[PDB]
Nucleic acid binder design. Structure first.
Ligand SMILES: [Ca+2]
Length: 579
DNA sequence: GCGATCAGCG
DNA sequence: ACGCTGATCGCA
C-alpha cells in the first residue's frame, strides 16, 4: 500500500544529498545490538536495504559518514551508537523527529514515529509495538512486513520535517533543536559508546564483604525482633514493628503501615531495631543495585559499562540514565561512596576529572526572579546552603557538617518550590508554627523570589505553559483545574520547571562548548558522564593542568546571567578520588 | 505491573 | 502538603 524498491544492492540515487533515513534497532538497549533493516526516502524514491549488503558497501558507508549528505531521522542517537558498534560513523543528521516532538511537548511521551506523526494528523505509519509485538511475543516480522514499516517510517519523517520545524520556529525553539539538542545527541552518542571502565575485582570483593555484614545485621534484627521473619516483607515488618512491638503508627500507605526511612528515623527513640532495619536496607541497596546490578551489565571483555542517556524523557529537559543508571551512584554515606572507587579511567596513566556547578538552581533563580538580595548573595559568592544550615541548626560556619549542609539544601529548594509548613516541620523535626515562621522569614529576605513564584503561576494560567531560558516548554493544563490538590501540584510545577529546566539548558550548552574547545586544543580528554549539573571526563594525566583551567572556564561562560556561574572541580585516579 | 522504597541531582 | 528521575523487590 506504499510503493518502494526492495533493493538488492546500493545505487547512486540512494545517495542523494538529502534523505530520510531509518537504521532500525529493535532491542531497547541498542548497545552492540543488531541492525535489522534500513530504509531511505529521498527525491528519487523509497528504498529498503538489507543491512548485510548496505553496511558492507563502501559507497553507502561513505554516504553515512559524509556530513554534507543531510539525513532526517527519528532517534538518531540509537542509530549512531548501533553503527559505532559496527565500526561505522554516522554524520550529517540535520533533523531528529524524536527531539523535535520532545521540544514541542514533552508530555506526549513520544517514543516512536507513529506517535510523533499523530501530533500533525499523519497516520500512514504503524506504531512500532503493533509491528514487533510485546514481551515474549516480540519478534522481527517477515521481511516484506518489516520493509514496509521502515519505509513508512522514513516517508513520515520526510513529510513531517517541515511542519515540525514551522511549529518549533513559532515557539522560538528552532535554534533549541538545531544548535543544542541535535549537537548534544551526537556528543551523548560518543559518551555512551566510550563507556566507563569498572574495576570488577574491587566490586566483587566489596560484594563478598557486604554479604557477610548483611548476615550479622540480619541476625541482630531477628534477635531484637525476638523471632525470625522476612525483613523485606511489609506484612511481616509492619506486623513486627506496629503489632508485636506496638510501635506508634506515624504514617500509612494505601496498602498498610509505612516503613519509610523518615518514619523509621522517628521511631529510633522507641526501639533499637529500627536503626538496624535502616542499616540492613542500606547494605542491601548497595548489594542489589550497585554491586550485583553493576556486575550484570559490565561487558566482560572490556570491563566497561555503557549507559544510555535518555534525551527525550524528562518533563524539565534533564537527561536520565538507564541500564545502568550512572546518575545515582552512591556518594553521601561513606560506605556507599566507596563504590565510586570501582569507576576507573579506561587507559593507563589517564585520570578522572569531575566539574560541578555550585548552587546552580539558586543562581538561576536569582537571575530569573531578579531578587536583589539573592543576586547580591551570589555576587559575593556566598554559600546559601551553608548559610541556611547555620541558621537552621544554630551553629557557626565552621560547625556546619556535610550532612547539615545536605539538609539545608532540601530546605532551600523546598521553600522556593512551595513546601508547606507541615512538610518543613516534618523534615526538620521542628514545630509547625516554627516552620511557618521560618518560611515567612525566608521570603522577607527574598521578596523577589516570592513575587516571582506568584507571577509565574499567573503566567502559566494565562499562557497555558511555562518556559526556560532557552525556550524549552512545558504545558500545564492542570493549573486551572478546580480540584485543589491537582491545581496545587501544577502550581509547584510552574514554580520549579523554568528553574530546573534552565539549569538543564545551561549544562547542555556547556557540553557542546566543551567538546568544541577540546577539539580545538587537540586534547585527548573526553566526556564520560553528565549528572545534571556535573560533567565527568577522563584524560591523560599530562592534560590535567590544562583541563583545570579549560573546563571551569567553558562551563562558567556557557551563558551570561545577572550573577556569576561558579564551578567546583577535582581530579584523581578513580571517580571516588575526583572529589 | 505497580507501589513503596531509596539511590542521586536540584 | 518542594521538584526531576531509575532499579529493586514483594505483592495488604
Ligand atoms: Ca552542584
Amino acid at each position: 500500500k506504499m510503493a518502494f524498491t526492495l533493493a538488492d544492492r546500493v545505487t547512486e540515487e540512494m545517495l542523494a544529498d538529502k534523505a530520510a533515513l531509518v537504521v532500525e534497532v529493535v532491542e531497547e538497549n541498542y548497545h552492540d545490538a543488531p541492525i535489522v533493516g534500513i530504509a531511505v526516502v529521498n527525491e528519487h524514491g523509497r528504498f529498503f536495504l538489507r543491512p548485510e549488503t548496505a553496511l558492507a558497501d563502501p559507497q553507502f558507508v561513505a554516504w553515512l559518514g559524509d556530513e554534507t549528505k543531510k539525513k532526517s531521522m527519528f532517534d538518531s542517537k540509537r542509530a549512531a551508537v548501533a553503527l559505532k558498534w559496527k565500526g561505522i560513523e554516522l554524520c550529517g543528521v540535520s533533523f531528529d523527529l524524536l527531539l523535535a516532538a520532545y521540544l514541542l511537548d514533552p508530555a506526549q511521551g513520544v517514543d516512536d514515529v507513529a506517535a510523533a506523526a499523530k501530533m500533525k494528523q499523519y497516520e500512514a505509519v504503524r506504531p512500532d509495538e503493533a509491528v514487533y509485538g510485546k514481551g515474549a511475543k516480540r519478534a522481527v516480522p517477515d521481511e516484506p512486513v518489516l520493509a514496509e514499516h521502515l519505509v513508512r517510517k522514513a516517508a513520515a519523517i520526510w513529510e513531517l520535517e517541515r511542519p515540525f520545524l514551522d511549529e518549533l520556529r513559532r515557539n522560538e525553539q528552532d535554534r533549541l533543536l538545531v544548535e543544542l539538542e541535535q549537537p548534544l545527541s551526537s556528543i551523548l552518542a560518543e559518551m555512551e559508546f566510550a563507556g566507563v571502565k569498572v574495576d570488577t575485582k574491587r566490586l566483587e570483593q566489596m560484594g563478598k564483604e557486604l554479604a557477610e555484614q548483611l548476615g550479622t545485621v540480619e541476625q541482630r534484627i531477628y534477635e531484637l525482633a525476638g523471632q525470625e521473619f522476612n525483613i523485606n516483607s511489609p506484612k511481616q515488618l509492619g506486623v513486627i514493628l506496629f503489632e508485636k512491638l506496638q510501635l506508634p503508627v506515624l504514617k500509612k500507605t494505601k496498602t498498610g503501615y509505612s516503613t519509610s526511612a523518615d518514619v523509621l528515623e522517628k521511631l529510633a527513640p522507641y526501639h533499637e531495631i529500627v536503626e538496624n532495619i535502616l542499616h540492613y536496607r542500606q547494605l542491601g541497596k548497595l548489594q542489589s543495585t550497585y554491586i550485583e546490578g553493576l556486575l550484570k551489565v559490565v561487558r566482560p571483555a572490556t570491563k566497561k559499562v555503557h549507559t544510555i542517556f535518555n534525551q527525550a524523557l524528562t518533563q524539565t529537559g534533564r537527561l536520565s540514565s538507564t541500564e545502568p543508571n550512572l546518575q545515582n551512584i552512591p556518594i553521601r554515606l561513606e560506605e556507599g561512596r566507596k563504590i565510586r572507587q570501582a569507576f576507573v579511567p579506561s587507559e593507563s596513566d589517564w585520570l578522572i576529572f569531575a566539574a560541578d556547578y555550585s548552587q546552580i538552581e539558586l543562581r538561576v533563580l536569582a537571575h530569573i526572579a531578579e531578587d536583589d538580595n539573592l543576586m547580591e548573595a551570589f555576587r559575593r559568592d556566598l554559600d546559601i546552603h551553608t548559610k541556611t544550615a547555620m541558621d537552621i541548626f544554630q551553629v557557626s560556619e565552621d560547625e556546619v557538617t556535610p550532612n547539615m549542609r545536605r539538609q539545608a539544601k532540601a530546605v532551600n529548594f523546598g521553600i522556593v518550590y512551595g513546601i508547606s509548613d507541615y512538610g518543613l516541620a516534618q523534615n526538620l523535626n521542628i514545630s509547625r508554627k516554627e516552620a511557618a515562621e521560618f518560611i515567612e522569614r525566608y521570603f522577607e529576605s527574598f521578596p523577589g523570589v516570592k513575587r516571582y513564584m506568584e507571577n509565574i503561576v499567573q503566567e502559566a494560567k494565562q499562557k497555558g505553559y511555562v518556559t526556560t531560558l532557552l525556550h524549552r516548554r512545558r504545558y500545564l493544563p492542570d493549573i486551572t483545574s478546580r480540584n485543589f490538590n491537582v491545581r496545587s501540584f501544577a502550581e509547584r510545577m510552574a514554580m520549579n520547571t523554568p528553574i530546573q529546566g534552565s539549569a538543564a539548558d545551561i549544562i547542555k550548552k556547556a557540553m557542546i562548548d566543551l567538546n568544541a574547545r577540546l577539539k580545538e586544543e587537540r586534547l585527548q580528554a573526553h566526556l564520560l558522564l553528565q549528572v545534571h549539573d556535573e560533567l565527568i571526563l577522563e584524560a591523560p594525566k599530562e592534560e590535567m593542568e590544562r583541563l583545570c583551567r579549560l573546563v571551569p572556564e567553558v562551563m562558567e561562560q556557557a551563558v551570561t546571567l545577572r550573577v556569576p556561574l561558579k564551578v567546583d572541580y577535582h581530579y584523581g585516579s578513580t571517580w571516588y578520588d575526583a572529589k
